[PDB]
Amino acid sequence: KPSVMGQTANASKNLKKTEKSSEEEIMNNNISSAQIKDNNQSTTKDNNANKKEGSEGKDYFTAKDVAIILHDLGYVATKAEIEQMIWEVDENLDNKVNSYEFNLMYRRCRYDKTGLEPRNLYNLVQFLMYL
Amino acid sequence: DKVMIKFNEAQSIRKTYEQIVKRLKEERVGYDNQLAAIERSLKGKEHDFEELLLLAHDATHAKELAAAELK
Amino acid sequence: MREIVHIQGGQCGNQIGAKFWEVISDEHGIDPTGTYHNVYYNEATGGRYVPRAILMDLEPGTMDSVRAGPFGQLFRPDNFVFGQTGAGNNWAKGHYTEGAELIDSVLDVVRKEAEGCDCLQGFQITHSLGGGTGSGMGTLLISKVREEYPDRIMETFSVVPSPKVSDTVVEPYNATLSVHQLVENADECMVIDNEALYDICFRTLKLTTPTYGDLNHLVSAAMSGVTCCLRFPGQLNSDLRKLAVNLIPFPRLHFFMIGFAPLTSRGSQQYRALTVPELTQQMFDAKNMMCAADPRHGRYLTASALFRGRMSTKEVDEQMLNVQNKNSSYFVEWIPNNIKSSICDIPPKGLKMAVTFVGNSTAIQEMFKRVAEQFTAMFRRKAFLHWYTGEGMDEMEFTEAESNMNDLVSEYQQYQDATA
Amino acid sequence: MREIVHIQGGQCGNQIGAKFWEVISDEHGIDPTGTYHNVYYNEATGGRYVPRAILMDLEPGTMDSVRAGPFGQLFRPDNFVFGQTGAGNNWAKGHYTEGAELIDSVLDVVRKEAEGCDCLQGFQITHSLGGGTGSGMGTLLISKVREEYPDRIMETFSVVPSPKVSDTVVEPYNATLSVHQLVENADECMVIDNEALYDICFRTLKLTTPTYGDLNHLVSAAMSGVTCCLRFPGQLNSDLRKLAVNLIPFPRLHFFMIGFAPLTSRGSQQYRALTVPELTQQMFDAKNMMCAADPRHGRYLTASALFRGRMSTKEVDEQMLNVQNKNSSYFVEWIPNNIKSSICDIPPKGLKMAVTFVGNSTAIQEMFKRVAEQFTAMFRRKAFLHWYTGEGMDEMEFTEAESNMNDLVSEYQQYQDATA
Amino acid sequence: QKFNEAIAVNKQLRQQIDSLRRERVIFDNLYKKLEKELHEKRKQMANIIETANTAYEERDRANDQIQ
Amino acid sequence: MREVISIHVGQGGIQVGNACWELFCLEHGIQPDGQMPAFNTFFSETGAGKHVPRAVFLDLEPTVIDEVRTGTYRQLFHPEQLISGKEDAANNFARGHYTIGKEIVDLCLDRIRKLADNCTGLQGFLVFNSVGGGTGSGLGSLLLERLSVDYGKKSKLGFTIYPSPQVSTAVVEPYNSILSTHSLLEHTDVAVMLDNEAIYDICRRNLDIERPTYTNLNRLIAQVISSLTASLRFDGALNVDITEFQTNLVPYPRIHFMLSSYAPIISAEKAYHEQLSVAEITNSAFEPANMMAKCDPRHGKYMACSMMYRGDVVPKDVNASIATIKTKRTIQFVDWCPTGFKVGINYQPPTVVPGGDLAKVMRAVCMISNSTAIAEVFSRLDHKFDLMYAKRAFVHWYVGEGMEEGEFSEAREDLAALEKDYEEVGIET
């Protein structure tokens, strides 16, 4: 169920955000929230993220690796759109994806109030942790 | 039908984006405040070093006159 | 300077040229008598300004009628290339038997008018695609002038077969025969159609009793506004070649739709304001075109705009910026800043502003395909053929004309959506 | 600024809008010709001020009659949305078959008038609940504008079925169909009725030969006084939203009764004094309302007052203090200081003072219940139904409209006496 | 017609919002550069009691020699 | 040296500031031209030798704003200090603090940013926000928040006009006032309260004019403020310090809501017939009928009192009036403050405005006091707030504007914390 799952999470979010709107229809901040967000045994996520994405292993992650992972997943690698998947969460330096940036994104998207932040890149992290 | 569905979806997306934008604005204000505070605290550093310069100079200047007399 | 020569063709082209010369005389302050009370006119002893306008046609009743109406003294008595038989709604008649014996009278007179100038930057043809004379004779003149003068820019204000009805039964044949000899040797085909012209004089203008002189006046005001940026000053001037560059990125997709503004109701001409944002509304409004092809059913390969009147340049900048901002994918995005803008520094007769929009877009390909469809229908089933085949033409050329039209449109459509 | 757009509906709404524009022109010094001899008007070249007033209706005889009378040149010739068949006193006619094909002409013109401004703070509708066109067409326009513009405030100067007689036999059906689609998408319904209007022009004003233009002038003076605090200065100004907040504590109980003052006899206009205590007497007098519901048979959920003229603020303070002091339980006491007060700084044409009282109270619930009663009577016994049922409407919607009216009134009544 | 206006407004809002998003991103890059710079000034603060202590131990020695 | 900034946010504050500046020019000798035929504190330099005030008139509703920009006082203000909105805050706090506040806050902050850069020796702020309306509540709250998070160290004296005791120009006053009180606590370092009933009584039965109006009220407030700022403007005998005001009138940072009073308020028709001695004025000084706000002098036990003497005042009549007021039993002070009196002498008499009911006299005194009576205004506002909050009224107007519901209650018991402390601090031992 490789593509249909990225479609599930998508459609669930599409309904979730409609209900989030319904809620209002009826009736150092970054780090201070990061530290408290989920601190589960993320050695699974770290070892898995390096095992599936981190090839060279120097705190650096590009679009070529995500493109080849997408193609290996039997997915139709859109030639240039994967750049947006790399970019949507890049906040310090455009074309800089650090392991610390994985921590920040993973964490802000894992434990938060609403979500909606990208809803579209860490779905792949959810997939790799899923299988 | 697909037109209206996707239009409502794009509406939700924009609402999301302005939420993210106002959040980033508030955290930018927080950055400004922390920055101003820390900059003052670090001005205190330069002042403390500058004063201890003179303190060290005085402590040496007294000893220089003491040397000749005690001998 | 930077001359124009005004050759005509067919009764359509003859009437349109007559009214265009009427408009330019009434704009430059030229009477029907030919005085002032050179970019278009010529000096003549006695203080006269003669338009270097050639009227060629296979019938003289049109010639007589254009002489009879007002502003007739403009044209001098040599440029009336007289045809006596008439092609009779037959491309073969208008292009082979009578072409190959009128070519050279027209050659002598066009060499006349061309040596009359120093630098002939561009030509001027107005003709039809459906009438035998207009179509055949006109595309033949185009071929000949493009044979001897390869450095000029060719330009045809061309009327096409009408959608709802064909004006002459062999409109499809004559039209494909005209475009097949139009594509390679005509550099800017401003596509006009009688029916869309009817629509624009009907809808927003209260005109309930129209006339052919009226449509001629409309399209001639547009025809004057397309080039009025040339003979007049301006903060940001252009020409036929800056326009041609900014309009065609490929030598094939060079057929253009045109519109001119302002045009509103007269009884309501006081209630409305009159501003440049309103000019943009007016013509980026779909209905204001002069072709039976709503361009928002396609894409804009590029588009040029030419202002008339003295206002700021902040205007044109926010103008094409705003319009690109919302109707972006109504244009094509594979080309940066696909809207070109220029300013002529003089407003129209009696009014405040004028705007001319010209567009190299991919919505006339359906016009071409409807022409080819009507053609192929009458063509396989052999409708109305001996008129073309008993006069030294073969349907091998018809097949190649049809296929060439189809080739043009296939590039048009794939360039609509080509992105990288 | 803080714009208004004046859409009309039905012959009633059309006449009222005509006379309201007459009043505002005669107040702002605008002739019937449209000059000065922008919060309401628009600039037009030639020095003209056009009211952005749209007149939509399913019949043109009303359109022709409002054009014919004085002050007709105000409205420009596009905002006459012409209907040709007429709904013929049928909510189904005026809301479904002719609605769903007039919606979009009205949409284009309202987008026209809305982009014409920078900030459109509020709308303006005047229509009926009983006439087929007025009711259906108007509540449909309300639904559509509230569909695309969720941030504006909706406001209807709505006439209801008359108590002693129904103006059209299906007044109950059309009225419940209008309120059922009014409650959720109309933000301020100023409730007016022809009979109470008759009473107020009869009793204290000597008028023995009244006319529809006269009642229109009365309600239009009131309609100008409700908002005259906006376009003019004042020591203590307000708007549509301070008013809406101070008027509705709940999004449902937002239907308002209105009155305007001063209005006395003319033969006795000299014997009486003219003071602000007298203004308070005048409208806190029961009979001065414009609705067939004496508010002292109910309770005031809250009430707002808007002055016109330059006197002190000691006035308005002792004003609402005194009135609360005696008619306390005539109001509701569960809400503190339920009377809001503001001042516009300019008096009326030729007179000294003006006062506008608006009230969010619970005495229109009986109006709603009498409408629902007439409806249910004709409804079970099936009176006058095929006119609604043979045009794509079912009585399931009638049942839900009736029940929804009843739900509204049940909240009205329980909020009358809710105390803690 | 509704569809075309919908797409128009969506494009306008999206580009307009993302521009300001990147602007605030750069404003946070300002925190990135400063936090490091003021941490360097904190390393300079660490030259207090160290160098104040050069003064203080030199004061021990000096005043002890005087006394 | 000493410069003081005044924001006039809302429709109340903006008219109060109109009168403030219209009185300031006529006092300092400035004509409305910006031309003058000391002023250090209020009037700056323009390089052409003339003066533009250091103040900003801010308001969502632009009506009074174009009133001042096309009235007669256009030549004074700088076009950079008048920014307008095209909408209001609907009298609710959320539309002025959450929705429409954010795009005006940064512009106002940039203007006062550059204005505090303009003047050299800033000493204090004066926020003028009638909280009854949405702007003067929410936008003024946000302005005070930003002022305190940027400046901080500098004192802020808020002349906030609460919802009146029982009269009201709006019904939703109780909500958008309790919510501003939260920010009013921390930010407004000292808050001199205002209400309407007492100045109404004063203007009616003290100047004998029979209709008091807002222009007269704002002129009178401007006269009080002139008596307040005379000490720094002109030279006096024993000059007082506005930072001494805080250290002497803020015994605890929890009790800093203070009230005021002025004498003499008399027409010329009784000024010609009265003696108005220095000792005599000190009696009407603490007169409870003379009181400027809804506070009862015998309700509060005076914790701090500053007296502002201006004109021909000799110190010993002052010192003996202090003795007589401390002797008679009708007044009392808190036991922990055995001496809670601070006086300031000034040799500048009150200047006169042409067209005012106010009379020129030799001696004027202005009282400003930190006491414990204000808690009654607090509880009285809480009355209306609870009476409206118990029944759900106007709740949608607040929550549909980016506001949560719990802020109503958090502000209610926030002001209840003031009511608690104000009676916990002023008891015996």
Ligand SMILES: Nc1nc2c(ncn2[C@@H]2O[C@H](COP(=O)(O)OP(=O)(O)OP(=O)(O)O)[C@@H](O)[C@H]2O)c(=O)[nH]1
């Ligand atoms: N003392 C004094 N008070 C005033 C004056 N003008 C208005 N007020 C008070 O201000 C209160 C309303 O405060 P504002 O914030 O200014 O009201 P607003 O400007 O309409 O605010 P919005 O509702 O958001 O539009 C009123 O109840 C008045 O009591 C004035 O000139 N002098």
Ligand SMILES: Nc1nc2c(ncn2[C@@H]2O[C@H](COP(=O)(O)OP(=O)(O)O)[C@@H](O)[C@H]2O)c(=O)[nH]1
């Ligand atoms: N715009 C315009 N078009 C015309 C006019 N007269 C004829 N036409 C069009 O021109 C076409 C006739 O072509 P034409 O070459 O003149 O006919 P021919 O001379 O017999 O070969 C018809 O399809 C008409 O629609 C006119 O006065 N104005």
Ligand SMILES: Nc1nc2c(ncn2[C@@H]2O[C@H](COP(=O)(O)OP(=O)(O)O)[C@@H](O)[C@H]2O)c(=O)[nH]1
């Ligand atoms: N105030 C006022 N009410 C009117 C006027 N003309 C008609 N009405 C009322 O409007 C109602 C008619 O509704 P309407 O929608 O205009 O009828 P329709 O156009 O046939 O659907 C009747 O009940 C009348 O009482 C008028 O000139 N003034």
Ligand SMILES: [Mg+2]
């Ligand atoms: Mg306001």
